[PDB]
Amino acid sequence: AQLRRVTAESFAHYRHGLAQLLFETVHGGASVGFMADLDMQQAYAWCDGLKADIAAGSLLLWVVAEDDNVLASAQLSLCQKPNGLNRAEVQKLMVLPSARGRGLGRQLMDEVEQVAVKHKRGLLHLDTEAGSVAEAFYSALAYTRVGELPGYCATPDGRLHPTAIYFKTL
Numbered sequence: 095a096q097l098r099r100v101t102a103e104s105f106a107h108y109r110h111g112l113a114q115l116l117f118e119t120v121h122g123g124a125s126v127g128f129m130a131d132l133d134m135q136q137a138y139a140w141c142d143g144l145k146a147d148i149a150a151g152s153l154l155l156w157v158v159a160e161d162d163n164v165l166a167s168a169q170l171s172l173c174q175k176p177n178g179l180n181r182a183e184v185q186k187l188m189v190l191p192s193a194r195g196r197g198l199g200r201q202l203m204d205e206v207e208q209v210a211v212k213h214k215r216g217l218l219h220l221d222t223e224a225g226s227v228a229e230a231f232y233s234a235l236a237y238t239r240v241g242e243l244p245g246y247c248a249t250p251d252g253r254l255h256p257t258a259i260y261f262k263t264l
């Protein structure tokens with residue numbers, strides 16, 4: 095199982111594995127953008143909407159994989175505004191339910207942070223469901239908690255919940 099940065103040219107190889115990861119993460123209960131009715135048709139559409147920012151270089155995408163089998167993934171959105179070059183937003187960090195607790199989340203974030211540094215990004219920020227396993231995760235990775243935004247998004251079943259803002263100065 096290896097970590098690879100995905101390009102526009104290698105995307106096709108991981109597209110299916112990435113849609114299944116999103117699929118299992120959503121139905122595992124996480125708030126990562128979708129509802130309980132997400133099916134593979136919609137996961138594929140999510141994957142296809144990533145292709146252009148990945149080809150344009152503003153969205154970096156990684157996966158931890160066994161060939162085409164994707165066990166986890168992480169993305170970094172490089173801010174492109176003329177006064178925001180010092181920052182980037184971590185998003186879509188996900189690990190198959192069955193492969194959790196084995197350190198994959200952390201192997202991804204360590205890559206993300208090192209590439210962030212190689213792209214002169216002094217600031218990494220993100221938001222994630224308040225009270226979720228993702229909170230203890232970022233905290234363990236020494237990300238600082240800013241606080242919450244109430245009713246930020248709904249859980250896959252409809253319930254409104256807050257998101258919690260975290261950051262890391264690299």
Ligand SMILES: CC(=O)SCCNC(=O)CCNC(=O)[C@H](O)C(C)(C)COP(=O)(O)OP(=O)(O)OC[C@H]1O[C@@H](n2cnc3c(N)ncnc32)[C@H](O)[C@@H]1OP(=O)(O)O
Nearest residue numbers: 185186187188189194195197198199200220222228230234
């Ligand atoms: C911007 C963002 O991406 S927000 C999206 C966040 N993603 C999600 O909520 C998706 C659902 N969750 C997941 O896919 C996973 O649980 C992730 C990505 C949050 C990370 O999970 P894993 O890959 O299994 O984490 P990993 O084992 O690398 O975490 C390392 C440390 O984090 C902490 N940790 C991980 N899982 C947990 C948990 N369930 N409870 C408490 N602490 C935990 C621990 O400190 C752990 O060190 P340890 O194993 O010695 O105790």
